[PDB]
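During the second year of the project, the team shifted from modelling isolated chains to modelling whole assemblies. The rationale, set out in the original proposal, was that interfaces cannot be judged from single-chain predictions alone. As a representative example for this report, we include one of the complexes processed in the last quarter. Its constituent sequences, exactly as entered into the pipeline, are reproduced here:
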Amino acid sequence: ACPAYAIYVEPAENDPENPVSAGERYAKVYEINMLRCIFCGLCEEACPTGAIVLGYDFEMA
Amino acid sequence: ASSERELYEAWVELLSWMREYAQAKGVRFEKEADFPDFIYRMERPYDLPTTIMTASLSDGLGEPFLLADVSPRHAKLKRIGLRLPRAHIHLHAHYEPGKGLVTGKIPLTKERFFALADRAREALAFA
Amino acid sequence: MVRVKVNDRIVEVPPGTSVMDAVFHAGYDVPLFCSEKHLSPIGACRMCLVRIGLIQWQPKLAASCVTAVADGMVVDTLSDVVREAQAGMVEFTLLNHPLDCPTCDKGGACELQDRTVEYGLYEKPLELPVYTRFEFTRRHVDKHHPLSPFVILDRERCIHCKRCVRYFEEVPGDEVLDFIERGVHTFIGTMDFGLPSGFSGNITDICPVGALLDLTARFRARNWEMEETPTTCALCPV
Amino acid sequence: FFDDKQDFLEETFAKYPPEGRRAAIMPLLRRVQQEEGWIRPERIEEIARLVGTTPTEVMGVASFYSYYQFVPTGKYHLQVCATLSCKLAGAEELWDYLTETLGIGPGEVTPDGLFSVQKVECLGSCHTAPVIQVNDEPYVECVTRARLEALLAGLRAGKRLEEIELPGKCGHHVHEVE
Amino acid sequence: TGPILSGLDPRFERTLYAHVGKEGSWTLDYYLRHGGYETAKRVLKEKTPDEVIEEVKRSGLRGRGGAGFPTGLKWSFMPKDDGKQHYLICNADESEPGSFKDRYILEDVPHLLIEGMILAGYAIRATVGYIYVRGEYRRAADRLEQAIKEARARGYLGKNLFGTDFSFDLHVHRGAGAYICGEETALMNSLEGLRANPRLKPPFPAQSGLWGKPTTINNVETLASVVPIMERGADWFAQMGTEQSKGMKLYQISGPVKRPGVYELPMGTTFRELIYEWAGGPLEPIQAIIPGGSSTPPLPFTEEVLDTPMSYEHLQAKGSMLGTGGVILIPERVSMVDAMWNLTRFYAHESCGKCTPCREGVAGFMVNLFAKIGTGQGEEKDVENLEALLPLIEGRSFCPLADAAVWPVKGSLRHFKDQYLALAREKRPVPRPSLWR
Ligand SMILES: Cc1cc2nc3c(=O)[nH]c(=O)nc-3n(C[C@H](O)[C@H](O)[C@H](O)COP(=O)(O)O)c2cc1C
Ligand code: SF4
Ligand code: SF4
Ligand code: SF4
Ligand code: SF4
Ligand code: FES
Ligand code: FES
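Output from the structure prediction step:
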């Protein structure tokens, strides 16, 4: 969805004993590049389980 | 009806059994799916006690010999089903309040179930 | 060469070619799930329904992947009855399809998925929007089931085209998949293990839903993200 | 299985044109079905080998029909009709009583191992509704609490239904009231 | 009497039964000792294939299954000798509900049938016939296997016949039930030992079919009726009923009717005549009648309904058709929902899964509507839904099973709607049937 190509998600296959995600598939790598990003919020709306949800911290630098 | 609550509690029962029989014989337990109405919940509050919509007991070869599915929240004829594959045997548990989990009118109990499992297992399994 | 008119445009079409192709040739279009290239039609998925004229229409909608072509034929794929019947079929197929798009590794490249968005138009100016009219429990069976070191098999997903079975019977000549029970209960399964054949794997591309997937590439990226590089296989002299 | 039974093979293979080999699956199965009371994998793998076809095909064919079985049966495989006519003569209620007496429903076996139960759809003898079929032995026409309990009491006492009789009257091809 | 021969009158003579109920009539020698097998001898030594076609095409015979296709035309498609085989398949898996005419034909007077297949065989130059007998009919399957050995031993069903040069044989192939296997194309697969699903329709078996070689399928009645035709002339046949509605038919009945069974009545007869004169009136007044088969859709119990003929040309126009003549009477004690509930839980069971519309649609969507209505968890919404579902199913199947499953529920919402709307809208379950003895 993104217009900055700022969210890279490498998927991975869920452990059956210690699942770190409720579904059968998870995100072993989830990276987000802030210095690229524009802060649209199309990501959150596109995410169907609403996992990525924009914050309130903003004092980043 | 409040049948809902008993139905889900009965679904816990089926699960409970599946772990014991499974570990007893060395035949596998496996979660198949988890509810859409859990995965995709994210602001509607969750209330149910398990997350598992479908689950199975598998043999040494790796094919299932018993499938076990509950109906989720949405349903209009809410039931729990069993199915032996290849055999064309399909069992429908309804709930009748207080009576129990019944297949029609016969109570489904643990002992009943163990026998059902064994007749499945012994017949269908290759391993 | 035989003179066909689809809607309002004409096509030449060498004699005895399925209507479906003459449709696609003319630039109008129909959905279709059961008939892949280089495989016989056994018109079964009931999607490729048109209405046909020869002027007089017909009392029943012919499946264009099946019937031959003839003189001055009209084939209609815009009409109120056509779209309506398609809307129907989309919905019907989807009746037992379990929800999994985001984790379905068939991704943005799923014939069911896309067909739905292409054709499934009910009636909804200023009304409520409508979605699935089913409201009873779905089928549930096993899934994520390895058939072989190279092919994982869901059994929930499938839409019961014949493509994979059909292929195995016609083309490598070895049968290793065939339908099991009947009615709604039916499901594809095996009774030979490992899928022996040097040609087992092709069905993976052939399945037009995400039921049949490539185990070597199970969960290693979503379908679209890949850069798709045409090249030639050199591990043999073919 | 058919290793001892080789006349039976010649017998069923002979009936067809040689190029129509696949036909044999129905009879070959049907022999296994009557005589051991429910097919087993080995049988199907052999049947497959014999007719020169992969197991999976033979599995698909075998698994289609209504009659064939694949689990532990009892001694008396009880086949109750559930279609329209039969409903109108109270076949519904029969299945309620039957099942609740015996203690088991579909695809299960009785603790003695003399009774499996299974539904079936229109058996085509609507006029003398209801009916049951036990194993493959002719139709027990009519069922009434008596007629039933007599059938039961005989089976329970070590006699089939072909060798005992029941009260009532059920006609040849006309019969009376309902 | 006379050329419009309807009802019981002195000039109509029974022939399809007159031996059933009298046990010990399945001997070759019992049959023979009635003067039987003359008629086979006659056709074989006299007439050509063309003539035994041409005669029947006039006779008024027409399909006697759950189909009506004038049988002359059905033989007309035969290639009439090229060097290719031909096979005649007697479809004795009539297992559509409410129907049981065929059962006894097989059981008590087999040698009649067999003679009919010798006659038919000769006409279309076919040399082998399969009789696909319903699997659960055990009695019939014994008696047929038995009959065929007898007849073959004494050599009228042999590898050369008479002073002639026609030769014919039969094989029994005991089925395994399963309604859908009855369909004419399904049968050819079923018999061939593949999984049973219908074939496409641009080849007709006549023009190419079973193992490449052209096949013909005919129904048990159709075949039995060949003997009277060939015996006594086409004229003797033509008298029975109105024209295009010739011949007699083995009507059957059930429900709470006083004397149900098979009543061999001429065609064009009224229901009134059957239910009263013959079957001794009802036992409870009727809610609806499903006239013939289970395919056809119910008709309310009406005076104008009772008085309509039984044919393929008067029931046609009344928004029904005639199945197998197996009428069912539905009493008004029970609920129409509960009737159709049972009917469409049957149809759903017996689908083949090949089509989407009927796999998923009927056996998964539609049926559950019924459940919903008839458990009192129903609503007006569900009948509104159902209504709209019907044009989406009828068209779109690949074989005619679906259309037989929709019509009853189609017809039934026009006439009995009220009850459906009742039980749903009011959240009221069906009452139970109260008629188990
Ligand atoms: C869905 C379907 C099911 C059928 N089932 C039967 C059957 O069980 N028995 C039968 O004799 N004919 C059945 N038929 C019709 C026959 O295949 C065949 O068309 C017809 O019997 C030929 O006419 P005749 O049998 O009156 O000569 C069926 C047809 C369809 C479309
Ligand atoms: S807000 Fe999200 S969608 Fe938008 S640029 Fe940022 S990472 Fe992308
Ligand atoms: S798994 Fe795919 S190819 Fe096979 S029948 Fe199913 S939808 Fe078709
Ligand atoms: S197969 Fe297709 S329609 Fe089904 S869950 Fe996968 S992406 Fe979705
Ligand atoms: S209409 Fe039904 S029973 Fe007939 S071919 Fe289609 S799925 Fe099969
Ligand atoms: S592509 Fe035509 S019915 Fe499937
Ligand atoms: S409904 Fe039971 S034998 Fe026909």
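Residues 123 and 129 of chain C are 8 Å apart (CA to CA). Chain C touches chain E through 33 residues (CB under 8 Å).
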